[PDB]
Scaffold this active site. Structure first.
Site, PDB file in Angstrom:
ATOM      1  N   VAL A 219     -50.857  29.294  36.812  1.00 44.80           N
ATOM      2  CA  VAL A 219     -50.801  29.368  38.267  1.00 44.80           C
ATOM      3  C   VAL A 219     -49.843  30.454  38.762  1.00 44.80           C
ATOM      4  CG1 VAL A 219     -51.858  27.113  38.799  1.00 44.80           C
ATOM      5  CG2 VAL A 219     -49.369  27.309  38.648  1.00 44.80           C
ATOM      6  N   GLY A 220     -48.774  30.711  38.002  1.00 41.67           N
ATOM      7  CA  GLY A 220     -47.765  31.712  38.336  1.00 41.67           C
ATOM      8  C   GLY A 220     -46.483  31.616  37.532  1.00 41.67           C
ATOM      9  N   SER A 221     -45.837  32.766  37.301  1.00 40.86           N
ATOM     10  CA  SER A 221     -44.604  32.888  36.526  1.00 40.86           C
ATOM     11  C   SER A 221     -43.523  33.606  37.327  1.00 40.86           C
ATOM     12  CB  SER A 221     -44.879  33.639  35.227  1.00 40.86           C
ATOM     13  OG  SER A 221     -43.748  33.644  34.371  1.00 40.86           O
TER      14      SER A 221
ATOM     15  N   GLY B  94     -38.857  29.999  35.157  1.00 40.57           N
ATOM     16  CA  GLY B  94     -39.931  29.762  34.199  1.00 40.57           C
ATOM     17  C   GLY B  94     -41.330  30.113  34.674  1.00 40.57           C
ATOM     18  N   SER B  95     -42.356  29.592  33.959  1.00 41.84           N
ATOM     19  CA  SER B  95     -43.797  29.785  34.215  1.00 41.84           C
ATOM     20  C   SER B  95     -44.467  28.431  34.450  1.00 41.84           C
ATOM     21  CB  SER B  95     -44.473  30.464  33.027  1.00 41.84           C
ATOM     22  OG  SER B  95     -43.754  31.615  32.612  1.00 41.84           O
ATOM     23  N   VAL B  96     -45.496  28.400  35.314  1.00 42.39           N
ATOM     24  CA  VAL B  96     -46.233  27.200  35.696  1.00 42.39           C
ATOM     25  C   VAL B  96     -47.719  27.299  35.345  1.00 42.39           C
ATOM     26  CG1 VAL B  96     -46.726  25.508  37.556  1.00 42.39           C
ATOM     27  CG2 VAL B  96     -44.506  26.665  37.500  1.00 42.39           C
TER      28      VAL B  96
ATOM     29  N   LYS C 122     -44.294  23.070  34.419  1.00 45.49           N
ATOM     30  CA  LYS C 122     -43.374  24.198  34.440  1.00 45.49           C
ATOM     31  C   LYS C 122     -42.677  24.282  33.073  1.00 45.49           C
ATOM     32  CE  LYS C 122     -39.323  26.319  36.503  1.00 45.49           C
ATOM     33  NZ  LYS C 122     -38.066  26.150  37.273  1.00 45.49           N
TER      34      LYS C 122
ATOM     35  N   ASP D 232     -38.958  23.866  44.939  1.00 41.91           N
ATOM     36  CA  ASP D 232     -38.223  25.116  44.769  1.00 41.91           C
ATOM     37  C   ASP D 232     -38.831  25.844  43.549  1.00 41.91           C
ATOM     38  OD1 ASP D 232     -36.468  27.278  44.727  1.00 41.91           O
ATOM     39  OD2 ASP D 232     -34.694  26.068  45.172  1.00 41.91           O
TER      40      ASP D 232
HETATM   41  C1  LIG Z   1     -35.387  18.854  44.844  1.00 38.15           C
HETATM   42  C2  LIG Z   1     -35.438  20.346  45.233  1.00 38.15           C
HETATM   43  C3  LIG Z   1     -36.485  20.537  46.316  1.00 38.15           C
HETATM   44  C4  LIG Z   1     -34.035  20.710  45.803  1.00 38.15           C
HETATM   45  C5  LIG Z   1     -35.789  21.180  43.993  1.00 38.15           C
HETATM   46  C6  LIG Z   1     -37.029  21.385  43.329  1.00 38.15           C
HETATM   47  C7  LIG Z   1     -36.805  22.224  42.245  1.00 38.15           C
HETATM   48  N1  LIG Z   1     -37.701  22.753  41.317  1.00 38.15           N
HETATM   49  C8  LIG Z   1     -39.031  22.787  41.312  1.00 38.15           C
HETATM   50  O1  LIG Z   1     -39.662  22.421  42.342  1.00 38.15           O
HETATM   51  N2  LIG Z   1     -39.647  23.361  40.241  1.00 38.15           N
HETATM   52  C9  LIG Z   1     -41.090  23.511  40.257  1.00 38.15           C
HETATM   53  C10 LIG Z   1     -41.964  22.746  39.292  1.00 38.15           C
HETATM   54  C11 LIG Z   1     -41.495  21.775  38.424  1.00 38.15           C
HETATM   55  C12 LIG Z   1     -42.382  21.111  37.563  1.00 38.15           C
HETATM   56  C13 LIG Z   1     -43.755  21.440  37.559  1.00 38.15           C
HETATM   57  C14 LIG Z   1     -44.228  22.397  38.440  1.00 38.15           C
HETATM   58  C15 LIG Z   1     -43.336  23.073  39.336  1.00 38.15           C
HETATM   59  S1  LIG Z   1     -43.891  24.330  40.515  1.00 38.15           S
HETATM   60  C16 LIG Z   1     -45.265  23.502  41.295  1.00 38.15           C
HETATM   61  C17 LIG Z   1     -45.219  22.092  41.454  1.00 38.15           C
HETATM   62  C18 LIG Z   1     -46.242  21.381  42.035  1.00 38.15           C
HETATM   63  C19 LIG Z   1     -47.374  22.080  42.539  1.00 38.15           C
HETATM   64  N3  LIG Z   1     -48.465  21.684  43.168  1.00 38.15           N
HETATM   65  N4  LIG Z   1     -49.176  22.687  43.462  1.00 38.15           N
HETATM   66  C20 LIG Z   1     -48.618  23.783  42.992  1.00 38.15           C
HETATM   67  C21 LIG Z   1     -49.142  25.161  43.177  1.00 38.15           C
HETATM   68  C22 LIG Z   1     -50.269  25.673  42.467  1.00 38.15           C
HETATM   69  C23 LIG Z   1     -50.688  26.987  42.715  1.00 38.15           C
HETATM   70  C24 LIG Z   1     -50.024  27.790  43.649  1.00 38.15           C
HETATM   71  C25 LIG Z   1     -48.928  27.316  44.361  1.00 38.15           C
HETATM   72  C26 LIG Z   1     -48.460  25.990  44.146  1.00 38.15           C
HETATM   73  S2  LIG Z   1     -47.043  25.350  45.046  1.00 38.15           S
HETATM   74  C27 LIG Z   1     -45.906  26.711  45.348  1.00 38.15           C
HETATM   75  C28 LIG Z   1     -45.073  26.968  44.083  1.00 38.15           C
HETATM   76  O2  LIG Z   1     -45.892  27.185  42.899  1.00 38.15           O
HETATM   77  N5  LIG Z   1     -47.434  23.453  42.400  1.00 38.15           N
HETATM   78  C29 LIG Z   1     -46.385  24.170  41.753  1.00 38.15           C
HETATM   79  N6  LIG Z   1     -35.481  22.490  42.207  1.00 38.15           N
HETATM   80  C30 LIG Z   1     -34.739  23.399  41.374  1.00 38.15           C
HETATM   81  C31 LIG Z   1     -33.358  23.220  41.046  1.00 38.15           C
HETATM   82  C32 LIG Z   1     -32.678  24.159  40.255  1.00 38.15           C
HETATM   83  C33 LIG Z   1     -33.391  25.314  39.831  1.00 38.15           C
HETATM   84  O3  LIG Z   1     -32.793  26.259  39.079  1.00 38.15           O
HETATM   85  C34 LIG Z   1     -34.737  25.508  40.179  1.00 38.15           C
HETATM   86 CL1  LIG Z   1     -35.624  26.889  39.674  1.00 38.15          CL
HETATM   87  C35 LIG Z   1     -35.394  24.573  40.956  1.00 38.15           C
HETATM   88  N7  LIG Z   1     -34.909  21.872  43.320  1.00 38.15           N
END
Ligand SMILES: CC(C)(C)c1cc(NC(=O)NCc2ccccc2Sc2ccc3nnc(-c4ccccc4SCCO)n3c2)n(-c2ccc(O)c(Cl)c2)n1
Ligand SMILES: Fc1ccc(-c2c[nH]nc2-c2ccnc(F)c2)cc1
Length: 325
Positions: free
Chosen positions: A26-28, A29-31, A46, A153
């Site tokens: 989906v996009g690049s 950690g990497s997802v 991720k 985030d």
């Molecule tokens: C709690 C708080 C908001 C403060 C927070 C959150 C985070 N970190 C993350 O949100 N990391 C992202 C992540 C984790 C696990 C699995 C996936 C993902 S990214 C993601 C998640 C769900 C999702 N649903 N749809 C999409 C998607 C698909 C295609 C295109 C766009 C999207 S959504 C827009 C982003 O991709 N999904 C993508 N942290 C945190 C704290 C410390 C850190 O160093 C970092 Cl990097 C993050 N804090």
């Protein structure tokens, strides 16, 4: 210990349990988007890039895992699973985070009402755990087909949605920096254009002050820095604009909330909690269904540990994880 399978996609190696199938980048950690065989639902995975590269990276790895394990709210990214292909601490060098796949990011008045209500409901919860998001922008908001929203985030410039006190480098900003960002996102959804498209930090502040006016006397006296006061007080004095004239055509209730979210002095900005009670959200607001968070221990933030100590604490956090029902 489940069965893992190795596979390369977009120069990245992905080692996940058998339960996760159809890995699509989906996009690049990497997802990656995937299918969770155990639940039958689409997931987002991720993979953390070089989690223990430095003390900074190691602490950041621990920070993200701790945050994601704590977030249990409909409008905030939560953890379905967390795993590693390593079978020991010694071997431990990769972190994979699993969440619900929403499908898209953020980049009708009823739509804007529903979308902003969801941001604020998720933000009331994060703010209640003494957390400041600091980077709320359309790409940090995951949206599904049903227009259901989750705060996360993860190019649309961060600076455009940043509170003026951050541009000014004030070290003592509060949670209302996130309310500012919400105000910027809400205005963009209502008009179809970036409220403050600054080319740099100086231009960003110039655009902000054009709308909200230059600081009044009460705010000016809160500025300790001589250089910040010299710079601000040397700019041509400007009044706060009439939001009814700037946001002409928008629902007057949406204009009223915009005024409350975008007040220059952060001490006078509306909180997420107060905003949820605003007349604009009468169709959605339920004070009995706007929960707060359990206490979040962020004492680790003030500590200076070795890479192996941060690595070991991360490893214990992977092991102790309990999936949601
Ligand atoms: C709690 C708080 C908001 C403060 C927070 C959150 C985070 N970190 C993350 O949100 N990391 C992202 C992540 C984790 C696990 C699995 C996936 C993902 S990214 C993601 C998640 C769900 C999702 N649903 N749809 C999409 C998607 C698909 C295609 C295109 C766009 C999207 S959504 C827009 C982003 O991709 N999904 C993508 N942290 C945190 C704290 C410390 C850190 O160093 C970092 Cl990097 C993050 N804090
Ligand atoms: F040009 C300006 C002047 C003040 C702000 C501002 C908004 N809310 N808070 C501040 C602030 C900044 C520095 N020190 C403080 F104490 C409070 C933002 C832009």
């Amino acid at each position: 210990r489940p069965t893992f399978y190795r596979q390369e996609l977009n120069k990245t190696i992905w080692e996940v349990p058998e339960r996760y199938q159809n890995l699509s980048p989906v996009g690049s950690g990497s997802v990656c988007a995937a299918f969770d065989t155990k639940t039958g639902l689409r997931v987002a995975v991720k993979k953390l890039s070089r989690p223990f590269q430095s003390i900074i990276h190691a602490k950041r790895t621990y920070r993200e895992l701790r945050l994601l394990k704590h977030m249990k709210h409909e409008n905030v990214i939560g953890l379905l699973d967390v795993f590693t292909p390593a079978r020991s601490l010694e071997e431990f060098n990769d972190v994979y985070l699993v969440t619900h796949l929403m499908g898209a990011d953020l980049n009708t008045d009823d739509h804007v009402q529903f979308l902003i209500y969801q941001i604020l409901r998720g933000l009331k919860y994060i703010h209640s755990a003494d957390i400041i998001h600091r980077d709320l922008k359309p790409s940090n908001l995951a949206v599904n087909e049903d227009c259901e929203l989750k705060i996360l985030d993860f190019y649309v410039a961060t600076r455009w949605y940043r509170a003026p006190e951050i541009m000014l480098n004030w070290m003592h900003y509060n949670q209302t920096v996130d309310i500012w960002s919400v105000g910027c996102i809400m205005a963009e959804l209502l008009t179809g254009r970036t409220l403050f498209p600054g080319t740099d930090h100086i231009d960003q502040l110039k655009l902000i002050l054009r709308l909200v006016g230059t600081p009044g006397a009460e705010l000016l006296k809160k500025i300790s820095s001589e250089s910040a006061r010299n710079y601000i007080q040397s700019l041509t004095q400007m009044p706060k604009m009439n939001f009814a004239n700037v946001f002409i055509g928008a629902n007057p209730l949406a204009v009223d909330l915009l005024e409350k979210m975008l007040v220059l002095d952060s001490d006078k900005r509306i909180t997420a909690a107060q905003a949820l009670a605003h007349a604009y959200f009468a169709q959605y607001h339920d004070p009995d269904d706007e929960p707060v968070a359990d206490p979040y221990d962020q004492s680790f933030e003030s500590r200076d540990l070795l890479i192996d100590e941060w690595k070991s604490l991360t490893y214990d956090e992977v092991i102790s994880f309990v999936p949601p029902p």
